[PDB]
Symmetry: D2
Subunit: 384 residues, 4 copies
């Protein structure tokens, strides 16, 4: 009969976290190939460790791109420009092991399952915990790049814990954790003041979540102390190792597939994008407050072998999940070629997705964020 | 308004799938180090592509292990023993970039899950997908089905009812690497009998497999070359296969190549242990628990119990969570001690899933806290 | 006092020896770049070990070449096409770590380079390296043409001649051949097959029966089986067979490797020039044997050093100092003038990357031209 | 018929030259293995390029050594400690791809040469002796703070006018190219290196009499040298074999030394040939001696031996007669060379720059003139 408060957590990382460096390098190569050959087939994985970038996988393309210069320039853009910060794009190892050799009916290029999610609890239709964690990691990068907080270095991680009510909804911000790389000219006591003011307080006001941040918020800035070296130094990063940061921060189920370094023919990426597009339209059409949708494919088959709509008893208009799914099946063509055509995916738009999340990005104009199927869904259900 | 039937999917892969090669290599090095030094700190990632294995990361150990031999022997066990099958443990590249000292971590979120819909407390789609991929490897190694090669994938789709429960098997996909001596039609007859039919009987789900089942065997034609050749693999790229096949939420953390001091592993194991005890204690049919840690704090900063309205005994999820907090010590050091994690038990976990393994004796599968939970809740 | 017979030895290796695999890959990349962009700057090193090729260095080029496919195809042509032979171009690792960013032009580096020639063979080569190369080329030939079955690519040849008191070859003393093979054949079977189809064939093809009379020691796979070959348990690197590539130890060497270097690298172009000089000195009748050193300073076109030696074989009462004045009159040794006069900006180099850079009767290499004999004689006012 | 002056050149490089980085790393690994297990079989090649060290090859040892730490520590000792200088041992990539009685046969075939000359007190040719002294002094003035603003990579080269008798007569040209900080230019380096490297070494070597009159001195003649080492100049083990030996004065069989334990005849038989050549000259049998030796895989006794003394042979002896004395005194089976020179000791990292021969700063067993008595006594001499 005693009760505990349920506490839900999501995390994000900056573009200088070693796994995110790999995602960004993988999608920088994808975009360079797409800019010159929109039909490029790309399955490029990046590995980073002390002093090393290793790029591996398979491309089919008519484009020429200078991979080592793309890698070095992306590391410099992130801010790894010196041995003093743990990694230097100008002087690091770059090794390439890429193999270059061997319409809606086109079969899926692999089996797999993919989920999409949306909720009207934020303007960007994202869960509050991942939305706040991404806003904090984006702001931590912004204050470094613009000099709002001097003496910062690229690597960093954010983590937010909300209290939740008995109906599975956020009630209150409980705990914020931020860790940032920094120059030795500053110490943790200075960083605590700077990041509390210029990151956390700024983001709470920018997100309009004052109501959720009243009273005692536990804040931990660089709780382990000095954070001088970072990125790949004394560590390792790999493409596709931040797939929950990339999506919904653990609020939504995930099918396992990574996004970065994959062209749009990979259903792991394009069908996940299609499921965000479906979920967002289900919510925007007023059929549910929250919606999660699974799709699944068999290799060589165009039509999904599976589709699974869940709205967690937030369904509206007396509609069941089974009725909403029938409307989705009428309105959306989930054959992989039809997804690529309707969302105009064969464009170099992916390097921007490789840090700070693929979904609910109001800084970007991503096609899977369009709420342009609201009218068709409502009409399929005979709603006004 | 019209209704559609909800279809939920899970997948698994054989030990020959390039990503699972990487998980196994990472956990084989981990086990070799734990055998000689239980206190070893290990953060090893494996990358495979045409002709090469690259092992990267950091180890803090007193143990001497010969990594190139361990890698070669592991590929040969998997069955990659010839250029003919596309990869050879004896003749492939092995490159090691592991730091052993500095010379000049308890954070993140984790989920556990259990359901009483199977005897092993797993969701049916992932339990069936793992039984198919394990059985596909077995029929090769035993020569029950000849002319198979190690790489393969399985996928299972179940119809679900309006209450989010499985109602019947809909679709089975098996894709297997094979010798050029055989084709898709031959694999269809062999695999329907010796893999699909055999597993439906072995699992006792005949009543879920009546009527029309869609079976897709090598649906995209021949699959002669596989493993790393034209299909790069990395450690920790099968984290949904490793866990609950998409039935349960995930925190993002990979298991393989990580020693037990890493909460991405130990805390996810602890949450399986908590979820399984909640369901075994008759508090819920299905339970999902998130935990989360803040750097420098031993006790978790977050815990979140969800039983999807399957609550029993008139208990809310908040009440179940208070009992969990009284019964379970969720400090990482206490998890390591209570589950006796500092043992070379992990290479076995690196394919066919970390949870609900009837073939293994894993400490996070113990339902030894049921009496404590029921006593904390004043139940009989 | 007791006397001993002096015995001089030279060696060669097949195209399948791991060091020569690297030389070949490095020069196959160079040739592919020079084919589409003759102005390409290339400094590409190849490393082979079990399962992997790693290509490293720096290139400046407008050309696109697919390096992984070039590597795999070259390994296939050499005969490494299966895990059973120890290496497979189709399935091996290939990793690339290459960065991509008139006559008065200075040398790109310092360094010293030697050239040599001797009228003891028609190709102007010392007999010990001439014979070692013929054996290694023949060893490759009997495999590719299947004159001797069950052979695998990796092999080494070694020839030891007795020498007279005046430092000239007198007779063949010892021939060594180690060849990679299928496990179906043994040392005993290789010994019969290789004596007939390689050693006896070459002696006849070279016309050296007069030097191969009496008892010759023949050691064929003396260490036993040689089944696993190539990079598998024997790492290779570009520029680790520089004495095989040149005069087999008969002539001095400046230390510079040839393969993976475009002609702007004096290590290559100036060694080629010294061969051309040394060959023309002997062809012009100034000496029987000539060895010439040249050296450069980075950023300076004219050499800092030139040294002629003829080993007291000088003719016409001319000193080495007199022959050298003639060489300075006739030859422009500025790097740009060497590239121009020998037409070096062509894809001709992969051919050079095994069986030697000099004395090649199977190739038409510009540095083997005896086209300056009139100019040398006219400089010495010889008829 | 006019005359030109013959001009002979040799070069050396600092320990910061990318090829010598690879030799030093290969021999640092060999030494660490021999320290714990003298019977270690080692064939370790090092490759360096922008940001990366790759160590490949084969070891058979009972020894555990921490290879990445050895690599990083060696780069730090060399001076590559910053991205600013082009390479940092603390932050660079390190990848390892290593696979793990006296009639004992040669492990390989091949030919090896040794050389000695009484023209210097260390029995070395003057051009390579002077090139090595310059490269060692260029390192010393940087490490000791005699000349500021230097960086590790550098090359030296000397050209001597030679007489009709093939002997050095005059120092003609000295080249030094050094890596440096951007705060200094060629003009400053020319002043500093003329005094603290060139003039210092001419006095240290006692060759003032060869260095009179006009000497062409070329310091950083190609201009600025800010980045160096592996960045834009890939290095490999065994790519400075002529710098390692006699600077082109002597013939060479092709075999590299570094990264090889003493069971490799490429190393031990070249060491034996220096030992033989130096004792021939120390015994008073010749002013200059060059000796080839050659082996066949599977056989202990050499298949070839060749003595050349370039007409400097004394006491009415021919090279055929010197060679018979050599065969009586010297056991040239590999196991016998390893035994007599006590080669199974961690002495090799010190040989990996500044040459393997004529090293008055080391006490190398192959430099011993401990066999002159046996040679004289086998030739029936006083
Ligand atoms: Na539901
Ligand atoms: Na709930
Ligand atoms: Na002479
Ligand atoms: Na002589």
């Amino acid at each position: 009969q005693p009760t505990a408060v349920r506490l839900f957590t999501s995390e994000s990382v900056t573009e200088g976290h070693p796994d995110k460096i790999c995602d960004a390098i993988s999608d920088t190569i994808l975009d360079a190939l797409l800019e010159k050959d929109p039909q490029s087939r790309v399955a490029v994985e990046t590995v980073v460790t002390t002093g090393i970038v290793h790029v591996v996988g398979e491309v089919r393309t008519s484009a020429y791109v200078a991979i080592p210069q793309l890698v070095r320039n992306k590391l410099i853009e992130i801010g790894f420009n010196s041995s003093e910060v743990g990694f230097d794009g100008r002087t690091c190892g770059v090794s390439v092991s890429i193999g270059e050799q061997s319409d809606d009916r086109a079969g899926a290029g692999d089996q797999g399952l993919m989920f999409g999610y949306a909720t009207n609890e934020t303007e960007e239709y994202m869960p509050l915990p991942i939305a706040l964690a991404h806003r904090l990691s984006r702001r931590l990068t912004q204050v470094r790049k613009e000099g709002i907080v001097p003496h910062l270095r690229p690597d960093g991680k954010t983590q937010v814990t909300f209290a939740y009510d008995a109906q599975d909804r956020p009630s209150h911000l409980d705990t914020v954790v931020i860790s940032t790389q920094h120059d030795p000219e500053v110490d943790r006591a200075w960083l605590e003041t700077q990041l509390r003011e210029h990151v956390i307080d700024w983001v709470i006001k920018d997100a309009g979540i004052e109501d959720l941040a009243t009273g005692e918020i536990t804040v931990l800035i660089n709780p382990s102390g000095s954070f001088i070296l970072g990125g790949p130094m004394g560590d390792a990063g790999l493409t596709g190792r931040k797939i929950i940061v990339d999506t919904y921060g653990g609020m939504a189920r995930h099918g396992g597939g990574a996004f970065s370094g994959k062209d749009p023919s990979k259903v792991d990426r394009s069908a996940a994008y299609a499921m965000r597009w479906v979920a967002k339209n289900i919510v925007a059409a007023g059929l549910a407050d929250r919606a999660e949708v699974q799709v699944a494919y068999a290799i060589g088959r165009a039509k999904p072998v599976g589709l699974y709509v869940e709205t967690f008893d937030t369904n509206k208009e007396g509609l069941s999940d089974e009725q909403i799914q029938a409307a989705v099946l009428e309105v959306f063509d989930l054959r992989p070629a039809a997804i690529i055509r309707e969302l105009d995916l064969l464009r170099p738009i992916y390097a921007d997705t490789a840090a700070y999340g693929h979904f609910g990005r109001t800084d970007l104009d991503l096609p899977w964020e369009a709420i342009d199927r609201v009218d068709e869904l409502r009409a399929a259900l005979k709603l006004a």
